Design a protein around this ligand. Structure first.
Ligand SMILES: *[C@@H]1O[C@H](CO)[C@@H](O)[C@H](O)[C@H]1NC(C)=O
Ligand SMILES: OC[C@H]1N/C(=N\O)[C@H](O)[C@@H](O)[C@@H]1O
Ligand SMILES: [Ca+2]
Ligand SMILES: [Cl-]
Length: 496
């Protein structure tokens, strides 16, 4: 249950946030498969409320109306087509499962849904599922408002409404069955696993009951006995009665402390320095590596909607972001998820982005397709971080060094550090305000290696910086604090 089910040799998944199924299918074939990406986390594929005020925000997809595969990303046929094509090329699909709640209790009854399904929040009526008033925790929640009021009370955090979202009575067999019916439909379609949205707001035991109802993966693509990959979104930064460890029996958990701390260290906030990353991992109080799903930023906190705060690094901070992602992909801790976003007009007022609700690039509500520019970058406002040379090459770096131990660590007591992965790869970082020029032990076999951050290895030649490793495994590295990308990475496959 803790295995990603990716193809051997592929070690990361990418979140193609708000992408259309047709665009993801093409991407699997033209880019993801060729570049060695393990899989894709897709946005919720089930019908949601169509919110027009504000105009179609990204968060409307976290307010379910039914389990019909019909959204702004596409319909069920397009969804199945995407899963099939991606699987045939060795790229897995992971579904964002929104199973803790339905839509806001204050949402107007009617057919303002992505598939026209009728729903009535007021009377707890969702005929397309179907769910009724007997299927929600209204009578179970003990708060005066019916919403979660105090996170220090583990009970209301689970039984009450998260900011007004109707809370499903997950203890009922009927509700558990409708949810499992939905998930098994996806499993039989070919998905390899799920991101359980808002797991903190569900009892570990209720999740387990649901998981016990799931089938094994589609035997047309996976070996018999394969279980779906499960990673639960649990925000645990300490200081709360709920611990992410309470969920280890169901699968992996999102380690939000990872990005929050990496961000403060790289930004060099309050005395933090990269030299302190020598014992990065459990040594920093993180969950066990084999139970962790790590990432620098996620769809919520890159726009200040989750946990991590102002320390979180995103594509907006391009230079430092590439460094954080590089460190993450080079370090052996956890299973890595790469973010792929779209640009929106950030409008800061009193320290807060008033346009944090803006949905994906669109034409009157219809999501724009991902266009590919001649330099492999994307158009139509899709950022496509997964296509940035520095990030794409580190995704490959992780595959190449998979299994190799963390070794040959070096640091200058400040912000210039380096380390290798067995004898398959080596990486160097310079985050100090002065240049780095030193000869280091890399542990790599003698030869000429192409730096994969500044360039590529194309037809027996390097398009960027070249590194020369001597017989003793030593090599000289020179990185100016003025370099566009203040770090260098070389591996077994970038060797000339
Ligand atoms: C490497 O690049 C040089 C030009 O810089 C060229 O002369 C040479 O043929 C290239 N090597 C290969 C193997 O293509
Ligand atoms: O930040 C509040 C809440 N909001 C959420 N999404 O908007 C998360 O699913 C949940 O884990 C988090 O605790
Ligand atoms: Ca709940
Ligand atoms: Cl997440």
């Amino acid at each position: 249950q803790y295995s990603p089910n990716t193809q051997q040799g592929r070690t990361s998944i990418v979140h193609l946030f708000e992408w259309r199924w047709v665009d993801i299918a093409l991407e699997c074939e033209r880019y993801l498969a060729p570049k060695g990406f393990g899989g894709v986390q897709v946005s919720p594929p089930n019908e949601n409320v169509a919110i027009y005020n504000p105009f179609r925000p990204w968060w409307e997809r976290y307010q379910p109306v039914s389990y019909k595969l019909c959204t702004r990303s596409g319909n069920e046929d397009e969804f199945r087509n995407m899963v099939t094509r991606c699987n045939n090329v060795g790229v897995r699909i992971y579904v964002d499962a929104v199973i803790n709640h339905m839509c806001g209790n204050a949402v107007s009854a009617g057919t303002s849904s992505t598939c026209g399904s009728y729903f009535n929040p007021g009377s707890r009526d969702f005929p397309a599922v179907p769910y009724s008033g007997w299927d929600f925790n209204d009578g179970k929640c003990k708060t005066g408002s019916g919403d979660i009021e105090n996170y220090n009370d583990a009970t209301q955090v689970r039984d009450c409404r998260l900011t007004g979202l109707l809370d499903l009575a997950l203890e009922k067999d009927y509700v558990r069955s409708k949810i499992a019916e939905y998930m098994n439909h996806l499993i039989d379609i070919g998905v390899a696993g799920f991101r359980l949205d808002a797991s903190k707001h569900m009892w570990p035991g209720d999740i387990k009951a649901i998981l016990d109802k799931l089938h094994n993966l589609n035997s047309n693509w996976f070996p018999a006995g394969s279980k779906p990959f499960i990673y639960q979104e649990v925000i645990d930064l300490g200081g709360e009665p709920i611990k992410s460890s309470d969920y280890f029996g169901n699968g992996r958990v999102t380690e939000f402390k990872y990005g929050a701390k990496l961000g403060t260290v790289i930004r060099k906030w309050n005395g933090e320095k990269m030299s302190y990353l020598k014992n990065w991992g459990e040594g920093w109080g993180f969950v066990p590596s084999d139970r962790a799903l790590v990432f620098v930023d996620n769809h919520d906190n890159q726009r200040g909607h989750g946990a991590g705060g102002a320390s979180i690094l995103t594509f907006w901070d391009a230079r430092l972001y590439k460094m954080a992602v590089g460190f993450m992909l080079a370090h052996p801790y956890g299973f890595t998820r790469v973010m792929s976003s779209y640009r929106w007009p950030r409008q800061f007022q009193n320290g807060n982005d008033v346009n944090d609700w803006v949905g994906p690039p669109n034409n009157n509500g219809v999501i724009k397709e991902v266009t590919i520019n001649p330099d492999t970058t994307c158009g139509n406002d899709w950022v496509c971080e997964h296509r940035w040379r520095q990030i794409r090459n580190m995704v490959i770096f992780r595959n190449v060094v998979d299994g190799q131990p963390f070794t040959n660590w070096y640091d200058n007591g400040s912000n210039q550090v380096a380390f290798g992965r067995g004898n398959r790869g080596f990486i160097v970082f310079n985050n100090d305000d002065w240049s780095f020029s030193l000869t280091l032990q890399t542990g790599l076999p003698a030869g000429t290696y192409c730096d994969v951050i500044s360039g590529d290895k194309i037809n027996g030649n390097c398009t960027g910086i070249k590194i020369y490793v001597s017989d003793d495994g030593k090599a000289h590295f020179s990185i100016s604090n003025s370099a566009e990308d203040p770090f260098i990475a070389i591996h077994a496959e970038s060797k000339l």
